[PDB]
Amino acid sequence: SLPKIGIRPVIDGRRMGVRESLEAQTMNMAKATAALISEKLRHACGAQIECVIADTCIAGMAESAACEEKFSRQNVGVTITVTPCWCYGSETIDMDPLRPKAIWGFNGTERPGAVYLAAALAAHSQKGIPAFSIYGHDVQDADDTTIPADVEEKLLRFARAGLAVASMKGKSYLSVGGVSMGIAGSIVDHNFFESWLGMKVQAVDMTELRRRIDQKIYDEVELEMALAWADKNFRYGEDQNAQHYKRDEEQSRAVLKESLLMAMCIRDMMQGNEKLAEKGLVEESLGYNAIAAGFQGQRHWTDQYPNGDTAEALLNSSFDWNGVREPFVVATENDSLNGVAMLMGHQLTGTAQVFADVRTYWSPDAVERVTGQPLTGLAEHGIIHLINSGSAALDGSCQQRDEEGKPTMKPHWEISQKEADACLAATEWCPAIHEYFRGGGYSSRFLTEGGVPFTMTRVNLIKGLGPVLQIAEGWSVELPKAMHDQLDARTNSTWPTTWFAPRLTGKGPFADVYSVMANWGANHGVLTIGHVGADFITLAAMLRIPVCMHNVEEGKIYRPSSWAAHGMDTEGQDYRACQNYGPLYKR
Amino acid sequence: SLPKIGIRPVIDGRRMGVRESLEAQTMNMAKATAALISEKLRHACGAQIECVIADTCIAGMAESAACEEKFSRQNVGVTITVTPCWCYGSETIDMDPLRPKAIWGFNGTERPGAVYLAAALAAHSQKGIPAFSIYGHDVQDADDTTIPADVEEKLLRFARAGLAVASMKGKSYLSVGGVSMGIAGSIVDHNFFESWLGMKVQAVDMTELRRRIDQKIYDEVELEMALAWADKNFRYGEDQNAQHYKRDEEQSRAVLKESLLMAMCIRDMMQGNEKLAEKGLVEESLGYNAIAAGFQGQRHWTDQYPNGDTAEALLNSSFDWNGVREPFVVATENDSLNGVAMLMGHQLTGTAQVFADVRTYWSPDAVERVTGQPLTGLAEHGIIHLINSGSAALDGSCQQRDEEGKPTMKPHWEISQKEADACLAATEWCPAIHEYFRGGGYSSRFLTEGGVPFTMTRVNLIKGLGPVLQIAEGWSVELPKAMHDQLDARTNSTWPTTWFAPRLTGKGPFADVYSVMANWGANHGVLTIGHVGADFITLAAMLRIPVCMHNVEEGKIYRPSSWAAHGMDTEGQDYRACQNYGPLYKR
Amino acid sequence: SLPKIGIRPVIDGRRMGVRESLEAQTMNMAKATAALISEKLRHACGAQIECVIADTCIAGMAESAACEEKFSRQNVGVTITVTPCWCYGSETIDMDPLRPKAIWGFNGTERPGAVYLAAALAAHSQKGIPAFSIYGHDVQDADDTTIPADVEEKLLRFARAGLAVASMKGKSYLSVGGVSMGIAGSIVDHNFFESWLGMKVQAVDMTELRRRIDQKIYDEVELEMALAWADKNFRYGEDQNAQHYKRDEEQSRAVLKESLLMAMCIRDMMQGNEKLAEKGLVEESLGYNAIAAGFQGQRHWTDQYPNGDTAEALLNSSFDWNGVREPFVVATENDSLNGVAMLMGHQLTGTAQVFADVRTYWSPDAVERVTGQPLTGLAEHGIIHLINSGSAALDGSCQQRDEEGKPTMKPHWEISQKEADACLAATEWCPAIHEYFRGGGYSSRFLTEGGVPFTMTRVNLIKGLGPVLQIAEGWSVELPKAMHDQLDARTNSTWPTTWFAPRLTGKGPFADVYSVMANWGANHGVLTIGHVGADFITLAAMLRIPVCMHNVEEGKIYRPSSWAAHGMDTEGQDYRACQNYGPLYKR
Ligand SMILES: [Mn+2]
Ligand SMILES: [Mn+2]
Ligand SMILES: [Mn+2]
């Protein structure tokens, strides 16, 4: 069952007609908040966000304890306190240190809820339980019940990030394999998951995956559907292996058969499968309660079996042979930390997530030297070649369309079957180069459309400091055919490409495009649809994860108010604040 | 190359016949220090210990810098400073923070080396680079060159532990697989290894072990030679599987072939193998430079392939089909912490290391009730049943015998081929139980001889504290045959057994045998020949690992001098000193 | 023996075509790197920098360990890892926490070394052993082996700073005396030298210097030579003492005898002298293995003996009566911390360093008032008067000429006996003011040619924070003869002067010349030739000394990549990182 949002209507507790004349506007403010959250947001899996409201208004500790009573039978993992009047600070606040929480005070004069706001926040900072401030810019009249725009932005940005926190809590990351080729993020730090994210790590040796294929621990008929669906939809590309390693058609099919089985089995390991209990496999039917996972792959699987290019691509996509569905989060090379960003991205936007190698920086001087023509448009300052080593959510094609017909990526509940199939139509499945992937495989090649707003992210673990978050907002660019073809043939022309131009600021890591590339803390990165840096910044704050690098605009930074107290500078306050509060779940 | 010991003859710098009169004595003291070590100790692998001696006696920084220059070319991992006279304190001490160091000062009057000792230990403690103190009880005459027994004991103990520290440095732990059945020690902590031991960790998925077998990455002739040896030498035990799950003589054969192959490939992966380079297989031939390893096994491997019972038991022995050799160190269930303790065990003694489940405490009352007779002798206060899940070095039979003819375990260089054969002859190979090990395997059942002194060790990781070492000295015991048979049938009769009685002290966890069992901080322990507690304590202080439990006498506790300054109490001083100096290699 | 630079060619392990295709290009990359360093850089003492290359390319732990055995024995104090391909991250990195480390990734598409780069740094940052990123701006063709300019700059800045770190390790600072007149820097912090610089501190009482002179512990024949050379070249200036304190010739000669004997004797105390051993003085022959020194002088030496003016100036110079040579580092007033800035400067340039009082800030207003003229050219924003109290390296005249006409200070291997003679000739040796230096002495007066680019530095020790480094890049300026003669005579006309204009930046302590003066954290500073701010910064980052004050171009800040993780702000990231990683050799 899913996490719910709690709403606390707090009130001035004194009578003689004072409390009485506020009970109507106060409850109504609560119900307006819950309606707005339910109207305008869903959980990432698509279900409706349920809100829970206190039975009475809250004036002091007796009502607060009864509200908490109620909240705690109902699995609420985020709370919003609201009021249009003075109330008695520390008598009425939410003392629970785990849940993200915010307070919204009506900017009024007959109704001075934002004066409670200031005192309630002071209580919060003083008691070490930071809270988020919702305070509208414009005085509203005592009877105006319309929620303004600046308020809505904050109520929705907060609610979104908080549900992301609540939804991770209790869940698993499934490490299918160990380290891949000495990549840092594939050394899965269990304490990081437990302490900062409230998550668990289940480790399972890639042999288990081989056992499930070999011992028929999957729905045999689902495979037939998968193969049938691949025949209908899969357009193949040129095998670029040397002739003596090229595979024939019977070998080619068995490779495709195994690849799709890989996907099915991994998925089954993540979320369970009822059909296995029906076959006498009750233990294997449960799965491991994982909301994200890693597949090591290289080297020990790929030196003998088909690679996970195809399974990674499909499981991270918004659809497969069973129809459109919520994308999973499955990380190439068991890179758990790229896995966590993907997970953050998915919990924030409801959409599919593109794993990427941060492959090349193409400077203007360099692009001219080799193609004889200049980088232009959004691309003029330099450009970054993002291109995973085989696999990417097919959504990354960006053949899905928004209401003005522009190319984009959507949440699964608004993806039609025509758009799913157009994503496939943009994709050519290419044989894995044998020497690297000795057991074979099919890479999901597509070319991401131009001018699409994107946000690149990466979590890194730093000894002595801990987790940090990197963020770079930009756009995909569209290169002239001759130019694209040339830089692509030179690189890895069997692999999915996105050409990325980061927005610059003139300052620090965003002085020029080279600086963006050079300060990136790993070889992998995550691409999330939209400009969603502010959403990441907020969530990084609820998790007490410093943001070490970002290009989001000053005025959009939204953190608990006690951050302001660790400094005016928006980087210094964050390291100090994050140092102070530490990880949420244990230290 | 092996670590060398550096020996520093340090002297009074002033002349007018003073220094001149002390040169012979000072340098001959240094050479006798070297001769004693090389007579009495060997590296764990069996090689001679090499001791480098400075070119000149050292009376200041110039000569000290020359000595360090000389030592930095000869791979010296531990130093001993010796002197018969007064010398200039901080001008002469070894300043290297990383290496075990000690100071032996001659306890004379005309030759007051122990006065320098006191002053140098003070500089060491004030400059934060602790050193061990060697100071004989009895005043010695100025021309006495013989080394008293109390000084020998300390020099030898300091060197044992010192070289263990230096031999782990730079080397790998090989994790073949990941976590086994959620056991803490098999969630492998790369940082503990890097920071406390100066080791790296190579992780490898168990599918590489499969790949090596399937794709014939091994010496094909050695297998045949190994199978031959196995046929000739292996006694077999009653097959206790239910009839429908039993294997036939053909499938039995295969389980054996594969069990020995795993032995071979795990070994090959640990240390490399040049036959693979002859064979065309140049990448696999190097190995991973591991002095310890673990094999995950359950669940994911053993649910389809033969178990590591035979591999682990043979590898952990001082002998296989290629004859007597140094025993390897391979933890069952990838229990890396038991690994470390076996590592420490093997480096301190050169002997084979018994991995055990700390399985049952049998109180006096419990034994009377189930058998109708009481425990008596060394067992009268209670008994701890030590018994791994199928594997244990065959040395552990203790069929090997000393000069007195008593049962014992020995360094591999004192083991005759007659004794190797005798340990095999005391061993019966028993089929794995199918329900638990679905791909089969052969366990290694022997009963450990009684009256042999052992030391039970375990390392654990405590969040917020770091590594700790537990130690229990005691003796194996022999039960009368009806008692043994009865308790054995009740427990896991196909597995190797050792009945252990820990020496009690009346205090703490050693107040009674129950408390020893209760305080043990994991399901697994390691059993090391003799009473080697003091060696382990010394080694731990060198690694700054607090010892949270031991039963060693106060007067044998031997640690760096600056531990006295942390308190009179032998536990308080230990936690505070380790907290102060912290891990050796980093942070 | 001198530190060497170790080069680690790193490569994809997989065979079957791939590794074999890369062995040549990888190993040449490495050969070309070593070659660049040996052709373009020298040790400060002038010797050729030897490099050591792994015997094979490194693709995993076995070769990594092999490369380390070869480095361990060859005195490698710094490593540069190079690759043109993808490699297995944390299996191939250099794990030694003490050594400065660089990684160079080739920016190719077919050769994606920079992708290894990003993944190895992530591994470095994750494991707490920061490493410098060397990454070219422009993509090179697979077949291009030219090393671009931006890569060259960083290879050399890194190497230059790396050798400085390793050249200090194990060497002594010789404190000749103790505190001089309550100056902080002269209360020598032994723990600072040992923990941050890996050095030792040998203290000696000035009476020992008195002893060498009076009992003739020096080369008597050399003394006749040193006098004859002084006679020929020493141009004596005016005696500004009140008449009753001037000295006859016979008394003035005795002062010069001794001033020169102080140079010989301090030098011999620093580094030994084999002639003392010919003369039967075996103990005093060894020296104290010092690379830096300080001489207290005031108050207790100078109230009865000739001061250190002449000695300090000649020892700090690149020449004396035995010809050109490496300049020593000898701090006046035993200001050990100015000694540290000097040693740093000498290690990073091979040049003579200029010890200075930061004496007077002359504002624009104030020069108008006093001289009638205004400050023009580089002096227009303010000037700072740099005048040590009696001595300075004669190199600081800037009578040396570079390959052009221009005035400069040079590495001694590029200094002619002509340019030595010339440096002496632009210097007047003026008697010491008796009331301050009652033992007499000769001050070394010269005036520094203007327009010369200079970097000013100081190390300060801040209780509760540790060491911090101060940098100010600027120029010497020339002033009208009438303007300078007013300011000189108002101040201290017998001491060497340099007029200094610091380059401003609008913000912080570089907002105006006043603020540079006001924020300088000591009364003393060091002058180093050229704009070597960025060298100081990089060397400071290697030693984990935060920079509290600098006017260096943002874009030239070159620090280990894990600094970037501690923030975008280039100052906050430095305090956080330094606080994290702490001193190199012990905490
Ligand atoms: Mn990748
Ligand atoms: Mn077990
Ligand atoms: Mn002064």
Numbering used by the authors:
A (entry chain C), B (entry chain F), C (entry chain B): 5 to 591
Question: How is this structure described in the published paper?
Answer:
Here, we performed biochemical and structural analyses of l-fucose isomerase identified from a novel species of Raoultella (RdFucI). The monomer RdFucI consists of 19 α-helices and 23 β-strands comprising N1, N2, and C domains. In the asymmetric unit, RdFucI subunits form the hexameric formation arranged as a dimer of trimers with D3h pseudosymmetry.
To better understand the molecular function, we determined the crystal structure of RdFucI. The electron density map of RdFucI was well defined from residues Ser5–Arg591 for six subunits in the asymmetric unit. However, there is no Fo-Fc electron density map (counted at > 5σ) that is suspected to be bound to Mn2+ as an essential metal for substrate binding. The B-factor analysis revealed that the temperature factor of Mn2+ (70.53 Å2) is higher than the average temperature factor of the protein (36.22 Å2), indicating that Mn2+ is present on RdFucI with a low occupancy. The biochemical and structural results indicated that the active site of apo RdFucI is not fully occupied by Mn2+ and, thus, isomerase activity was low. The N1 domain (Ser5–Met172) adopts an α/β-fold and is involved in the substrate recognition of the hexameric formation of RdFucI.
